[PDB]
Structure formats: C-alpha cells, structure tokens
C-alpha cells in the first residue's frame, strides 16, 4: 500500500515529470493497476517521449493505460525497429492515437506495401510515417492507387513524394486538381525519357494552396468553372467504378 504509492510518485520524479502532471497521472487512470500504470508511463519514456507530451496524450485517451503489458512492450520494440522514437513518435501520437490499439499485422502490411509494392526506401518510409500518420488508417488499396497515380500519371519520383507530403492529402482532391490542370494543358505528363514540354506546376502549388488561391496561381480559371468540373469528374469517376 504505502510502498506502492511511494514508488509511483518516486518513479515519476526520477523521470522529470512536473508536480502537476504527477497528480494528473493519478487522476487520469480509471481502475488501472499501479504497477501497470507505471509500466505504461515508463514504456513511453523508454521511447524517448518527453514528460510533457506524455501527459497530453494520456489526457486525451485513457485506453492506453488499460492495455496489456506484453502488447505495448512488443509494440514499442516494433515501433523503434521501424525508426520511430523520440520526437518522431510525438507527431504520430496525436494524429493517430489508434496506433497502439491497432493490430500488428495491420501496421506490417502498411509498411511492407510501401517498402515492397511502392519501393520506398527504409529511410523514406520512416519520414512518411513520422510526417503523415494517416497512412496507417488508410486502406491498402486506396493508398496504393494514390501512390501510383503520382508516379505514373503525374510523373513524381520517390524522393519528391516523401518531401512534398503527398500521401497525407485526400485522393479525391488530388484527382480534381490534377486532372483539371492536365485538361487545362498547364500540366504535361512526362514521357518515357522523363522530359516535359512545359515545366509542370510544383506539387506544393497544386495541393498545399487553397482551392480559391490555387485557381488564380496556376489554373487561371474562375471559381464557377472549376465547380462544374468537379461534378463532371465525379460522374466520370462514378461511372468508372460501375464500368470496372
């Protein structure tokens, strides 16, 4: 009793936890075992996460505390194996809190699809996961279609895809903006040699820029015209799925 309470507060003091956070960590748990609570806290510290982000992520979701000790230690070994650690895991946690709860093979297929099917470098895979955590939630088939769309139809190579945060954006908005640019003639698909008649607009201009500003910068078309295209493109896409 007393020793269990003494070691919980003592351990958090050793890890640099703030006095307010230590009291909150006791309040965060809902029936969790004391040592099990410490193991979940310590496991996050093992991955290099600072105490301040530790309190924030536990505050949002209490399901992390009520997890088997074996599963998280097995997961944390897998997380560091693929290159996630201090700093990088912080972005993944608040964007994708479901990472710990999701099954291991779901993550394995996602990374293997990038490494084998998409032929992404292991260094590039870690950057994508760190920057774009929506990849894990995304379905494998839709993700694979999104990647090959940029590689073949758009002509974007592997290093540019990782740096430009392409995979995080929705597939639908990519189709709307790219095809409209392609039909406008402003975008030229690279040939077999890779040359283009006209320098294609940079990927940041296409996707990062807002819809209203995107038209003015590159498309040079009015807002009303683009709205009609989206309805036309949606009908073509809807017929495309039914036809195939």
């Amino acid at each position: 009793g007393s020793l269990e309470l003494e070691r919980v507060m003592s351990s958090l003091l050793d890890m640099g936890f703030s006095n307010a956070h230590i009291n909150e960590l006791l309040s965060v748990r809902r029936g969790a075992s004391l040592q099990q609570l410490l193991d979940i806290i310590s496991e996050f510290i093992l991955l290099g996460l600072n105490p301040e982000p530790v309190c924030v992520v536990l505050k949002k979701s209490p399901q992390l505390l009520k997890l088997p000790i074996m599963q998280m230690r097995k997961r944390s070994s897998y997380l560091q194996k693929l290159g996630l650690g201090e700093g990088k895991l912080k972005r993944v946690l608040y964007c994708c809190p479901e990472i710990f709860t999701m099954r291991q093979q779901d993550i394995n297929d996602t990374v293997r699809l990038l490494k084998e099917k998409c032929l992404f470098t292991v260094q590039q895979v870690t950057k994508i996961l760190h920057s774009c955590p929506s990849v894990l939630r995304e379905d494998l088939g839709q993700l694979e279609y999104k990647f090959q769309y940029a590689y073949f139809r758009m002509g974007i190579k592997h290093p540019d895809i990782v740096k430009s945060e392409y995979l995080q954006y929705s597939l639908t908005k990519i189709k709307q903006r790219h095809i409209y640019l392609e039909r406008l003639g402003r975008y030229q698909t690279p040939d077999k040699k890779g040359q283009t008649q006209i320098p294609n607009p940079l990927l940041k201009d296409i996707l990062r820029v807002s819809e209203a500003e995107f038209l003015a910068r590159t498309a040079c078309t009015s807002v009303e015209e683009f709205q009609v295209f989206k309805k036309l493109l949606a009908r073509e896409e809807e017929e495309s799925e039914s036809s195939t």
């Binding site: 090959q148 698909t189 195939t244």
Partner: protein
C-alpha cells in the same frame, strides 16, 4: 563436400590458432558469399568478449593490468593482452589504452553512479547517462556482440526500471537490462575508416576478390518494377 570447420578448439588460449580460409564456400562446397578468396594468411587470436569473467577460485570485482596492445588481422579494431591474477586473455582495446594501464571489471551496481574510466567494465545500471560505451551485451551472461568495430561507441540514452536504452552506432535505439556489462569509452583505431587502400593489389591482400564484371541493370529501384494498375497502365509511357 568433406568440409570440417577449423573452429574445433574447445579450450580458450592466448596462443594464435591457425585458421583456414573458406573462399566464400559453405559446407557443401558451393559459393555462398562472393568476393572472398586468397589474401595473406592469418592466425586467429581468441577474444574473450565477456569482460566480467572471475576466475575459478575468485569472485566479485577484479582488476587486470594491460600487457600489450597489438594488431589483430581478423577484426578492424586492435586488441589488448591483459593479465588478471594468474591468467591472461585477449580483450578488445579502447582508444586510450597503453601497456601498464590497470582496468577494473566489476558486477556491482551502487546506489549512485561512479566515475567511469575508459576501458573499465561496469554494469549498465552503474554508469552515468550519456557516457560513450562499447561491446554491449543483450542480456547478462550473453557476451559482447554489438559496438565491436574500430572507433564505434554507443550512447547510454536513459535508464528506467532496471532497463537502459543504448544508441547503436547506426543511430538505432536498443533496450537491454541494466545488469548488462559494458566497456566505457570508444574502441581503438578511431582513424581506421580514414585509411586509403591505394591500389587494387591491397584489396587482394585483405582476402577480397574483384566484383563481377556483369553490368547489372537490377538494383534497389531499377531491378524491382512497380506493377502499373490497369487505370494507370494507360499513362505509363507517352510518345514524344
């Protein structure tokens, strides 16, 4: 094939043991690793990677005096001959090690950290955080397997609940128990990677044969071909 491994000796000794080359051939006799063959003959010097190995009649912390730091052909780093009590054995030398120096080997984990000296062997539970370490082991009694190469050094990132995070030279974190024995400091031959082979002949002196002359269009990205999806199959190549 009638292949018998030369690694048949069962008793440790500091005597250089004659070893026979493989040439990249496995026990079957076929090539399994390419580019290996020939070179100057070498004698293997057995290395005791378990720094904390107290004698049969002794126990606990013990001390060893370095006799000589010499060149080892088998490994990139240099080795040191140390004598503790009535025995002598080979260990992996650190960057700053000379003949006459005294190293300490202990398995004690004190309440507070201790002044870490280069070349000494202490458990990971008694070393200050951030100190460069080398020749680490996964579990107690396993023996040093990581951070062996010349100049390599790990980082004691953190220690929580009897476990410690070790930053490997490949910038990868590893979690092991705090009772693992590690060596303080870097490994010898820091400027080993700064060597210049000079001529193709010196690579044949190290037992490395020239690469195959075939022009391999295959590679990490060139050889492996992403299969185009039927929708994207139309846009793969456009005449120009």
């Amino acid at each position: 094939a009638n292949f018998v491994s030369w690694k048949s000796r069962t008793k440790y000794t500091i005597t250089p043991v004659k070893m026979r080359k493989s040439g990249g051939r496995d026990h079957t006799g076929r090539i399994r690793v390419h580019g290996i063959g020939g070179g100057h003959k070498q004698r293997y010097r057995m290395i005791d990677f378990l720094r904390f190995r107290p004698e049969e009649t002794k126990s606990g912390p013990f001390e060893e005096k370095v006799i000589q730091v010499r060149y080892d052909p088998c490994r990139s780093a240099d080795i040191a001959l140390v004598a503790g009590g009535s025995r002598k054995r080979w260990i992996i030398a650190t960057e700053n090690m000379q003949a006459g120096d005294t190293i300490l080997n202990s398995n004690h984990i004190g309440r507070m950290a201790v002044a870490a000296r280069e070349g000494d062997a202490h458990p990971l539970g008694a070393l200050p955080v951030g100190t460069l370490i080398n020749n680490v082991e996964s579990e107690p009694g396993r023996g040093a397997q990581y951070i062996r190469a010349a100049g390599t050094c790990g980082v004691l990132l953190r220690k929580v609940n009897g476990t410690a995070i070790i930053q490997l030279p490949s910038k990868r974190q590893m979690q092991v128990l705090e009772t693992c024995v590690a060596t303080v400091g870097r490994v010898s031959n820091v400027d080993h990677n700064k060597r210049v082979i000079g001529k193709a002949g010196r690579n044949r002196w190290l037992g490395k044969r020239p690469n195959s002359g075939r022009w391999h269009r295959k590679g990490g990205w060139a050889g492996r071909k992403i299969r185009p999806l039927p929708p994207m199959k139309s846009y793969v190549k456009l005449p120009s």
